[PDB]
Design a protein around this ligand. Sequence first.
Ligand SMILES: O=C(NCCc1ccncc1)c1ccccc1F
Ligand SMILES: O=C(NCCc1ccncc1)c1ccccc1F
Lengths: 304, 304
Amino acid sequence: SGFRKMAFPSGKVEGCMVQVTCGTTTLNGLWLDDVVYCPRHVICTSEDMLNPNYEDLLIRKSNHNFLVQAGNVQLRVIGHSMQNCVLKLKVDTANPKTPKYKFVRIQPGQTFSVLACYNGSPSGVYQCAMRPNFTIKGSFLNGSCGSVGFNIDYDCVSFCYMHHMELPTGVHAGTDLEGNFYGPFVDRQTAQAAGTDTTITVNVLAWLYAAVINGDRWFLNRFTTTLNDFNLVAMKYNYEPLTQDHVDILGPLSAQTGIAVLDMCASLKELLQNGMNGRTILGSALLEDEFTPFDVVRQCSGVT
Amino acid sequence: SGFRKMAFPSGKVEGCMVQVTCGTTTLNGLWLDDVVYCPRHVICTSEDMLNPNYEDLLIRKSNHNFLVQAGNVQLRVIGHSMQNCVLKLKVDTANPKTPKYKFVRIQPGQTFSVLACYNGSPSGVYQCAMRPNFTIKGSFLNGSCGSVGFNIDYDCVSFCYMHHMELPTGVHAGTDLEGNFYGPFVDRQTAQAAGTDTTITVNVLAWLYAAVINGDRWFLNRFTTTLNDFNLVAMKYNYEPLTQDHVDILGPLSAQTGIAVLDMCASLKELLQNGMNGRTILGSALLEDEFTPFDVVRQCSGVT
Ligand SMILES: O=C(NCCc1ccncc1)c1ccccc1F
Ligand SMILES: O=C(NCCc1ccncc1)c1ccccc1F
């Protein structure tokens, strides 16, 4: 009973966080096996960040210029390389707390947990989604770069995000753990405007199913619709188009509630057209879109 | 930049979660030093729960009837006792992962992190508040009892909540780690209705300060008020009375923004009277009350 914005337990990731300092810049690194991953902008002065040539700046850096601290113990850097927008610092000690892990590149609308860190130390954990414009709406201050986003599948941590920057609009951009930015963003202090932050329709529908499972049912109506009709309304309200693939993904929730996906679409259509009228769904006055169908099933079934 | 509902990192608590089985009932226990704490209702059949005499039911239980499993290793129970509504199972092995800890009894309006567990295994972490009616709005399924609520102060875990039950209205009740229920609730399957779930005014004001710090400023108005005038409006809207103690607690946020507490009260008064008019504050269409002033300062300053 009840439905919360829920993060994965963070312990397995806490065991991987280190501090990386290059000159006067301190941020976070991820220590897996004998490699520490961090944003390549650790090598930049705030001045460098206006138009950095990373290959040229990196030539001036030696292994001994990368200070890596795990708790209050220094790690020995025996190699460094740049992969896209991350540095890989090879250290002489494998992290003894390395969990089973994968690097995965997520799609827009997929959710993940962020372990916000400063100076290699965990401050908090929260749940994010990759937005359709490839931003995330995080909570990050100076020093949080290198904080990571992840999912867990029982005992395997899938790392999907590393924090790199804040856009002038206070939204966040970063990379996968291969160093490739999500979306069109670059690690330079320049004009980078985000595109339309559309609503993740399939996630909203998942969350309406979660609401019905948890006894919030007032928005259920007498109507149905078609994908094409629903999509006309979605487009008007800057919702993502719903595909048959999304309908298929919602099948288990439909079966759990006995509410046909297209009937739930017709409920969502009325909520878009009519508003909430001062009512709430699962404690929200807006339609929540940062739960995936998989998240709803996981939280409604108590997976560990 | 940005502001998220943020939980404490959970690793230190993950290291304390065990499974407790008595007959056919499995739930979670908290293993600190050589004691495992769990809800006393572990000894009840669902039938027992209608009118349990816990002293009488416990007479039929021996140490060897309490099965305690830490990961896939059995712990040896060498003593048991009932303290209020918790059992303390003395085991022959001190938890090697025991963090620095305290047991604290929180006040209504105080927030904490919950590590939701099943079979002694962590499923997720989320942020809660003790409601003014001494319920919490959690996310708990069968098997989640004994899951705990906590705060961290650097390296010391203050445990404040252990999950015991779900009211017919789908809200949650539990104890401190001395086994005393929050509010009037009992560990019996009976008629237990919650009182008014009033809004935690001081937390709303904290969150409006968080909003201004993070650039959401549209709701700032030209007005001020007095505690007495504000309180007339609070009472009308089922908000908690604001006290001078709350004004004093908001002092650092007032100083950080240069917005007098009573000016922010006048902004909140207009939001109550006028509504949001389809606008959002920090991604919310309602006034959020599960961030304390301490939470806002912590998240806005990046404490680890
Ligand atoms: O440090 C600052 N801004 C960068 C914050 C940031 C957030 C998220 N990810 C990366 C970096 C700052 C501090 C004080 C005053 C003005 C500022 F601009
Ligand atoms: O197991 C059930 N309900 C108790 C859940 C619960 C939640 C939170 N804290 C303690 C207990 C249940 C399962 C299937 C059908 C009907 C039910 F009632």
